[PDB]
Ligand binder design. Sequence first.
Ligand SMILES: Nc1ncnc2c1ncn2[C@@H]1O[C@H](COP(=O)(O)O)[C@@H](O)[C@H]1O
Length: 133
Amino acid sequence: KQFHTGIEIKVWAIACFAPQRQCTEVHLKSFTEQLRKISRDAGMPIQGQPCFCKYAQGADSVEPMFRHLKNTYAGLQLVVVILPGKTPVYAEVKRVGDTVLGMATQCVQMKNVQRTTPQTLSNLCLKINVKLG
Ligand SMILES: Nc1ncnc2c1ncn2[C@@H]1O[C@H](COP(=O)(O)O)[C@@H](O)[C@H]1O
């Protein structure tokens, strides 16, 4: 439950399973900037430039995507996964990340990317801190 120091997240990825027309590029860039600042201020800095940011659709897209990521980006520390409401994509991200490829993933809801609040960003930093701590 305690906050872990020493975490720096330099290589990370975004997979957006929410529809681009709903969660546009500027939503992603804005969400990301807000996340960079609060994680910085908290002392678990996530660098502002993700190594990869793409839209995907459907649970079947998850495993080919993570394979690509794992095959392409050495030192990949985290995949942030944006979800549009209740979706089987969540189950699949966890199956593949935790069980198949050993890749750390953190899911977040589309609504919290379209409009951030300090508290929802805080919730996310803590979930991330526990994971990589
Ligand atoms: N069945 C589901 N469908 C969509 N989103 C989910 C589901 N289960 C959990 N989540 C979201 O996943 C996030 C937690 O992800 P994680 O901490 O990576 O396990 C929470 O913010 C939830 O909103």
